[PDB]
Each structure stands twice: as structure tokens, then as C-alpha cells.
Amino acid sequence: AIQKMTRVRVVDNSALGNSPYHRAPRCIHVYKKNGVGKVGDQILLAIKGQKKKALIVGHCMPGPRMTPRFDSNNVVLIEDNGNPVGTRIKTPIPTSLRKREGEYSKVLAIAQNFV
Amino acid sequence: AAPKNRRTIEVNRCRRRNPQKLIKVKNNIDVCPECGHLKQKHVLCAYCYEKVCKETAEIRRQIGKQEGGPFKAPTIETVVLYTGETPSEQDQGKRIIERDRKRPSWFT
Amino acid sequence: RFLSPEFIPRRGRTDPLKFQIERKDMLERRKVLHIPEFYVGSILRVTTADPYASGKISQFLGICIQRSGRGLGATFILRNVIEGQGVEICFELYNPRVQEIQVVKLEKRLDDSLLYLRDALPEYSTFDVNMKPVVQEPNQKVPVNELKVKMKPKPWSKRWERPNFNIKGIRFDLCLTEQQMKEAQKWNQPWLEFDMMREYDTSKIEAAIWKEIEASKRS
Amino acid sequence: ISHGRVFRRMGLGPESRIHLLRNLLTGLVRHERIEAPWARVDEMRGYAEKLIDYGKLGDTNERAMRMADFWLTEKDLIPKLFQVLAPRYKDQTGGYTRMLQIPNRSLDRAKMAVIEYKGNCLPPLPLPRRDSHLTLLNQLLQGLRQDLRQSQ
Amino acid sequence: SGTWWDEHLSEENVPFIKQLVSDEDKAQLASKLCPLKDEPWPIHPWEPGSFRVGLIALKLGMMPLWTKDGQKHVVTLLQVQDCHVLKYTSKGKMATLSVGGKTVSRFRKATSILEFYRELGLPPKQTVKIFNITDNAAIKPGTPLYAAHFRPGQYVDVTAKTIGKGFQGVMKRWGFKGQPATHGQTKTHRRPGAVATGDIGRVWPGTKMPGKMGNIYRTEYGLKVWRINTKHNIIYVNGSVPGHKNCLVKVKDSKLPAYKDLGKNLPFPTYFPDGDEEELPEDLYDENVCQPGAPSITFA
RNA sequence: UAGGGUUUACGACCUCGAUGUUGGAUCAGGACAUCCCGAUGGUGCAGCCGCUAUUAAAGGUUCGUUUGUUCAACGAUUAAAGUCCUACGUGAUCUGAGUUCAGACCGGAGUAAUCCAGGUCGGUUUCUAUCUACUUUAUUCCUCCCUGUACGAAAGGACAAGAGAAAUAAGGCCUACUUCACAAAGCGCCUUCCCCCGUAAAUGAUAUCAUCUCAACUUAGAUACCCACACCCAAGAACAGGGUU
RNA sequence: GUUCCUUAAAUAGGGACCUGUAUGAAUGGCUCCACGAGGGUUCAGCUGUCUCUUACUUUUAACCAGUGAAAUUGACCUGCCC
Ligand SMILES: [Mg+2]
Ligand SMILES: [Mg+2]
Ligand SMILES: [Mg+2]
Ligand SMILES: [Mg+2]
Ligand SMILES: [Mg+2]
Ligand SMILES: [Mg+2]
Ligand SMILES: [Mg+2]
Ligand SMILES: [Mg+2]
Ligand SMILES: [Mg+2]
Ligand SMILES: [Mg+2]
Ligand SMILES: [Mg+2]
Ligand SMILES: [Mg+2]
Ligand SMILES: [Mg+2]
Ligand SMILES: [Mg+2]
Ligand SMILES: [Mg+2]
Ligand SMILES: [Mg+2]
Ligand SMILES: [Mg+2]
Ligand SMILES: [Mg+2]
Ligand SMILES: [Zn+2]
16 A cells, blocks of 8 residues: 555666665655555656656555565556666566556566566 | 523423333232242342341351351361251261251251 | 364354355365465465466465464465565465465474564575475474574564563563563553453364364265 | 443453452352342353363362462462362263342342352252142143153 | 243243144144145246245355456355245235245244244244235245255345444444544544534434444345355355344345346246256356365466 | 626624634535536537537545645646535534734834734633434446547547446445454445436428428337344343344 | 755745845844753654544443532423425
8 A cells, every 4th residue: 555655665776766865765646546556556756856657566565365465665667658767676576467468568577586 | 501491390291201211010029939028030039038148147157156267268068057966977077067046947 | 183273163153054064165175185284383385376477386485474264264374585575475275276285394483473573684584485395204293493583673563572462482682671571561461361261162163173074084 | 332242341440350250259269159240240150160160170280270379369268169169060060150139239229149159058049949840730731741642 | 910931830841842842843844845745836937027036044154255267256155044935915016925034932922923823834933024026926825945046147135134333423324534633623533513504593304413323124236146055055145245143134036137037047936846856966056156176277 | 788796895784781703624505607427509620639508416526735824836636626605604513823812022103101904922712402403215437349440631549339447425244354352343345226308300381392399290208125021132321123942 | 035955746944135215233233162841944763643443441421229409591382495
């Protein structure tokens, strides 16, 4: 459940999430009719004082049974079309995002580990 | 809140004279086979209960007079015997509580 | 005998026919799979049949924290720190998938729920994913690997210092002080241990469950 | 809401409730008869059931010893509970004690009841004797049962 | 004075009377078992514009149920205890049919009900939920309604008394947001606000206010059945059923548009084990329900 | 030429033996001078995007900052963050961030006190319900074959129908997730069943053509809930309701 | 107010300018190491204030027994719309 103003942990190989900052990258708004957001939903993340898009890749709270549950709010950056920003994802990605195979195809191919 | 007008004796009666507040007539009163002081269903008689309470009071008084001070309660049962009545050969180890008077018409 | 804790029913006041049907369904399901003996803290290896994944058979390893639920709702959370990050999946012991449920190491620990591993360093949770199992010898007692687990600094997520949980597996001498220990003991409730009216006698129920299991196996 | 909620309220909390329960159990083990409100009466009866069960489990057991020591502050009553009330009921299973309601008190007019272990030595309370077997309805039922037996 | 059957009986007649009552009830049930062996009335075929009789089961509990697609689906358990027809009244709108449910002792019942149940060869029941039916389907009273009336792959509507919450407030009875807890609440943490404007010197009927929540009859529409048991007489209804465990519920057919003509393969009157029908297995499964004892599914 | 007093003003009809005031929180009832989902004409309408007119109250009208603000500015959205009355709705439901008070300053007027339709610091928000009134009666975004078709020169890109997951509100449950523990719940799951009057077209007279008709006419045009002592309860303040084989 | 930073979003806060025509040097003006329940902003941690609340203990709450009243009351057989 990544809502507004949530210290999200970025996991990418770009110069945005890896660069240091005097503030943690907090969320902005969830691209959904409700304030709650699960895996697969897009979210706007603030990094270095900007407002770049992102994508929820697992949440801290446990949703259904089969899906996993991470200890941190893992999130991978993304652009308008997406078109991911990073180049390598070391952390494991859940197998729930593989149900699209159209909206986020490059994100799955760039990922290395999988649950 | 504050009453805008004064209630009437009629409204007062209608409020207090309703069957809800009126005491309901109970039909759980029955005659006891013994003594005879109209007991109540599912409830013990008053005279018999008072007699049993007095008997227990006397028994406790005698036990305290025998045991002496507090912090006793031995690890053996008890047997209440009144005047006479030779102790039975079964209750040999059970300490006897010598009681006065004769046995009543309900102790067995 | 062992008898899994998922077969014994709750202390509710429902119809025994529901529990009987649930036990029959669980036995019919186990007739295909296996579901061997395992306690809390044992390293397992579930192989689910996920569709959207590189290959139908999807394996995963982790330590069993707690096993809640009854009947077909029997589940168990497997924790395992892989690539630094911690993952926790809830596998149900009665699903149409799940090809095999291998066991790597049979353990028991001291607490019946290892929910305190979240607020602990990853050293006590990082385990290899491709490690061979270990034999428990020809029928041997359950080894209780008694060991103290170091916890993270004071900022926790459930306050494991209070005695309401009764863990007895967290080294409080290397993390907490005397004032914190006293403040935690202040919340103690000695009247809960000597409350005989709270226990749940499950002797005749366990005997009936074992008799039903034996009757089903005989058929 | 209190659906399926057991254990009623008594004192200023669970601690006071269990303390009053232990005090009543000790007083009963001492005198074998106490007048208490119906709620506390049934609570003490249910607690004494498990107390007798524990006492029957065994004396050498450490758990039973600790339970008796915690539920009997008088100390002198633990030997009695272990060596008088345990063997005397070695033939029964779980049916012990006896519940009988008291009419009313004299001040607050409370619904009190009586408690006492079966047997004992105190005088017997006036139990609710059922109708005799030589009455009209009883004789009719006996005749009906005799006819049914003769039929088969 | 108020008397009861367990008053003027000795300790030697109570168990005798109990055994007599039990034997009489068992004999009555055994006699009422076989329906077709007496007078099952003319059995008409199925028609487009017509309905059938429902059931009155006992909500045991809830259990999960999976499908071949690999998804979780909540499923309830409704035990069809006894369930027999009481009477039948024709045309003031449509034909009706009285159906019984769980068995009840014949001691704490009224005199009129006792006489009505003595006129028929069945014991007294708890609830009596009358259903609506047409003139085509008409079964003689007293016949048994087993759990095999419904079949897998059908939508069934269930209605019963919900778990009453008592004279609850507003946040629980209606889900109001209520006032906060600070800035600057002092006496308001779960109370409501205004009622109906200010000029309105009264309160509009139907205004949400504190009251008794639950304990009312509510119907559910769009609950599919996945399995039916013939031995223990159990129904597998998807979703939740209003009520508590071991609670009598009213079962019948759905009224949805898409689920109104699929009653061709289903029995028009009721299930008659006396066949001329061939007994059914332990339980009938659906096409998408994963049966127990089968190998692990695979999407390959 | 006709309708309103939403704003600023005119008189002070009851209120100075008291209508307690602006905002904020929840709660909403009604109206269209309607943002849309529903249905149409025109168009400087080739299709998506645009504008005007007729009907529609079954619904909603987001998340936050500065700001006491009702007002005003800014970031992400959505078909959308509309207006008005309800004592400029609601203080016997709640707070006072200013406004009506006692203390001290900042700039000015004033010998002085004192004052500012100029600003700031903080500034007791009381009531045991007497009566009226009340206390359980549907929808939508997105995606897919249609289709990258019709349209269109090219970009760009339609209605309609079917299928799958999600979003407000309403009715239920603890067996799977969570607070938990012989319960109750949500963070979890199921269901939500038929229109809405303005126009589009034949035959036909006043007015033999033609004419959709405030002429006679032909097409788009409610079903389900509920109804025979004493102990315990998933029913509950008592009462009432269910069970006591 | 001009302008930079501080929030992705700033009549809030800090840094340099005065058409301050009514600031201003014992009506004392500007800096300054300590300190103020004086007035504001803010970086790492948070607490159900909220998103969306529930379960539990006590007082309170409901019935049984009694002492037992305030403010207030023109009488009331005490409804809705126009
Ligand atoms: Mg936490
Ligand atoms: Mg009390
Ligand atoms: Mg709240
Ligand atoms: Mg308060
Ligand atoms: Mg106050
Ligand atoms: Mg005035
Ligand atoms: Mg006046
Ligand atoms: Mg006044
Ligand atoms: Mg209009
Ligand atoms: Mg106002
Ligand atoms: Mg008012
Ligand atoms: Mg102050
Ligand atoms: Mg107030
Ligand atoms: Mg009243
Ligand atoms: Mg009035
Ligand atoms: Mg602020
Ligand atoms: Mg000072
Ligand atoms: Mg009183
Ligand atoms: Zn008597």
C-alpha cells in the first residue's frame, strides 16, 4: 500500500536513485481512483526535487497468498511510455507483473532475478 | 434542556400507571412438603435453609473449638455424631465431631 | 506421534460435520501429495506451478515462521533473504498446484512463531537456495537448536520486549538495558498462566482425529 | 457486542476478578459452603471443576503443585485438597459440586446461590425432590411403559 | 400456574419418555422417507414460465474452494436437515408451498402448532419459509426435499437473519466518518453531526440515526453453486450467507434474467431417490472445480 | 418585455429580561441558471477534439501547500473537483484560527488620557432530553476481436455489440491476509435485478399536391423479502426473539 | 514587492534593495558568546491526527433496593404541507 508521502526505496542503476540526497524519495500520487496502490500500479516519485514517474514493484504489506511480500517498498523508475530508466535490477521481482506482457515488457526483460 | 410547560397529572399517571412499571404477579410460589412456609420453585425453602445454616454454624464452632487456632485443616475427613450413636466401624480414621442434642428429621 | 497442528479444530462451537468434511478433504488431498512432518523454524522447499514465470515449476526456499489456519486454510510463511532483500511468501498446504514440498532442515527453536526475524540482521536469515537436504536419522527426536538471535536497534515493528508473546529466543542482554526490561515486565500478567479456565483440552479430539486418519488410511 | 463471550466481569479488572475467585475457592475448600451471587457462584463452580481435575491429575506433578499453591493461599488447604477431595471422587468423572439458588439477601437483595462438593459431612441441603412414582401421572406412565414392554 | 413436561416426572420416567419420543420421531421419519411409494401426485414436465421449490438448510460454516484456473473462491456450507413440505395453498397472487427446516422438540410448542403437526406425519419444525411457485409444479405435502435439488453450475439466492449487533451507534450502523479525535474534539469521537438543516422543525423519516443493527432478513442475489453432497446433504454456495453458524437459511432459485431458462436439466418438482434415476456418486463436481484426489494441475 | 434577491446598498416590522457571528470537522434535504454518464437538432460538423439549444436529480463533485478566511495563487488526476437556499444550513453535534471584552508593542493623531472599519502575542465555548420529529425500503474508467476499419489526401482516428479485471455507495462473513482468540471486525472476499418524453419516419383532411398528428393513427415507446416456571444463546439495556432429546 | 534557496506543489521561513513622503540612534538604533513553559520555519527517527478504524479493562452505560434534588413550568387532549 504505497500512498502519498511514503519513503520509497529506489532500486535502479540510474544516476537518480543511486545519487545521494538530503531527503528520501517520497511518493507523489497513485495513478488510480483510490489512494491505495498494489503491485503493477504506476506512481509518481520525487527524486532530486523532480517529479518522475515510477512503478510499484512489490509492497511491504501482504496482499494475497501466492504473491510474495518484501520488507521494503521496492520501486523501479519509469518514463511516460516506459521505457524504463534503469538498466539492471538486482533485487528479485515478483511473478505477478508477468501477467501483462504488453504494458511493461522491457521492465521484465531488464530484470535479472525473479520470485 | 428545560421543560417548556408543566406536565399534567394525567400524563404522570399514564407514565407511571402503565403495566410495564406495575409489579407483575408471579406464579412461582408453591407449598413445601416439609414444615410449610410456601417456598418458591427452583429456590430452597427459607426455614430449612435457616436450619441448615444454624447447624453449619454450630458445626464450625465445634470444629474451631477442637482445632483451636487457625491454620489447621488436617488431611482427614470428618464425621458429625450427636449424643449417643456408637461410631461406625467404617469411619475409624475420620475424627469425630461430638455434637449435642439428638439427630433431626432430615440428617442421614 | 506427531499429528500436524492443522488437523486439530479450533475451540469454536460449530457442527462437527464441517470439521469431518474438512478432514476428509485434507486426507484426500494428502493422498496425492505428501506434506511431511515439519515444525516452526524448519527450512522447506515449496515448488509451485506459477503460470506467468520462466517455467511452470517455480521453487522457493525459506524458514517457516508460523502456520495458522485450519482445514483447507492451512498456510505457512517462508522467509528468506535473497540478494539482501527479504521475501515472505504465504504457501497454503492445500492448493491445486504445489508439485512437491521438500524439507531441507527440520528444526523447532524455542518460540512457536519466528515473527521477530523482521527486526533482526540478515545474518540469521540468509541461506543458500541450492543446498541439499539433511537426513534426520532413522526416526530420531526433534533437535531443538537453541540459539540466541541478535535483533536490530530499538526501533522495532511489534515491541518484542513485552512478555505477552513469550519468545525466550531474543538476546535482551546485548540490546536492552535494565530500565527497558523493567518497563516490559511491568506489563506482565501472572494471572494468565495459572488460569486453568483458558486451556483447551484436546486429548479426546486428538484421539478421534487419529482414529479417523487410521480408518481413512485403511480404506 | 459480546457474542460468544465467556467469563463475566467482577471487580476492577481481570486481576481483581481472579483474586476474588481464588479467595472464594479457598473459603470453600476451608468451609465447603459459601453464599455468593449467581454469576460468581457459577464462575467458582467452573473453576473448582478444573481445580479438582488438576488435583486428580497427580500430586507428584509440579504443574498441579504450582496450581494448588497459586489457588490456595492458606497453604494448609493444599494437603487436604490433595489427600481428601482427590481420592474421595476417584470413581466419578467430571460431575462434582452442587448448584442451588438462595431466595434473596437482606440488604441489596441479591440473587445468591449455594455451592458445596458432593458428599462431604455438612448437613444435606433441601434438594428439589421430584414427584413421587406413586402419583396419578407417574402411575399412568408406568402402566404405559409396562404395556409397551409387553407388546415387544 | 405455569407448568412444563419436565416437572411432574420422576427420575425413572424422564429418560423413558425421551427414548419414546426419539423412537416415534425416527419411525415417522422412516415412514415419510419413501415419497413415490405412496401418492406423489401428477408430475408435470418443465416449462419456460414456471418455478420450483427451494430448500431450508443449516449454515455450518465456510471453507475455501479452488478452480482449474488457479484462483481462490469463498464457499459456504449449508446442511439440508430434514426439510419437508408442510402444506399447499393455491390461488392471493400465486400458488404457495410451506417448507420446514431443522427439527425441534415437541414440548416447547404451541397447542395449535402441535395439533397441525400431529394431523401430519412429521414432527414440529423451527422455521417455516413459504416459497412462491406456479400451478405446474405441485408435490404432495410431507415429501422430503434432499440436498440434491440443486446441481452444480447454478445461481442460488439465500436469505436469512443477519448477525444482530444490538442498539449500535452511527459509525457501526451506517459507516459514518464522524468527527476526528483532536482539533478540537472534547465530547465527540463517534457521535453524528446535524440532522436535517435548521429551518426544518422536524426530522425527515428515514434519517440515519443510532439503532438496532442487523437481526433482519436480507437476500443475496448472484451466488453460484459449485458442489452438492448426497450423503451428508450439504450445499456448496459461493460467497457468504447472511447469518451465523448453525443458522437456518432460506434456499431457492435465482431470479436474474440470464439465470431464468437454464432449469431444463434440473428437476422440475424435486429430487426422488426412488429411481428409475440411478443413485448419484458421493458428490457432483463442476467443470471448473478442482476435485480432491486428482494430480497437481499444470498450465503446460 | 418577464423571474430571483446568490453579492454590495435602501427602511428597522419580533428579537438589547440574549436570533451567540466568520470559518473548519461529520451530516446532509431541495432547486437548474447542468461537468458528465442517458436521449437529440444545428454547426464556420470529413472522424477524435470544439460551441449553442431541449429534457434529465438515479450520483459524485479528489488528494495537499501558502492563506484565520467565506475569497485568491500553485503540483498530479479523473467525463468532473459547478451555482444557490436550508438563521450568508448545521456551536442542547465539536474547536475559536479572527471577529464582541479586560494586558503589552509596532506607525500615526492627540499636552495628557485616549483612539485607529492598520498588524502581532494569548484570551473559561455551560446545560441531568419536558414535548414535537427520527431510530434498519444503483452505476462507471480501463483493456481486447471489431480496427489501427468507417471517416480521411496525409497525419490522426468513429460509432454500436460481445468478452476480462478494476472505481463511489448499499447488503453480508472469518475459512484462507491483518487487529486477533471459545467474539467482534478491516487491511480480505461475494452480490447489486427494468425505463425516464426530446426528437427521428409512412398512409391522411382542413389546405384533394405536400403535411411525423396540442385531428382521428402506424414504429423507436415489478419482480423479490416478511405472513402457525428455570437455564443457555451466535438475540439482547429490561422487554422482546431462538434452543433446552 | 523585485530576486535566489528552502516543498514536485509556500500571503509560511532565511539571504541582498529601498517612493520607510508615517523606521531610526537612552520614545535609544545595529551586531553578539550564554538563557527564556515568550513568538515562527525546518533535516534523520516517530505517534491511529488521517487515509480506514477496530478489540479489550476501569468509571460511565442498562435492571434490582433506598436517601434523593437543581434551572424551569400560563393551562396542553402536545402532528405534516401550502
Ligand atoms: Mg509496524
Ligand atoms: Mg461492576
Ligand atoms: Mg475517526
Ligand atoms: Mg476528549
Ligand atoms: Mg470544556
Ligand atoms: Mg437583541
Ligand atoms: Mg424570554
Ligand atoms: Mg434563550
Ligand atoms: Mg434543464
Ligand atoms: Mg450560520
Ligand atoms: Mg442550535
Ligand atoms: Mg500561551
Ligand atoms: Mg459546547
Ligand atoms: Mg423520551
Ligand atoms: Mg410540542
Ligand atoms: Mg505548515
Ligand atoms: Mg524565566
Ligand atoms: Mg433506583
Ligand atoms: Zn421447607
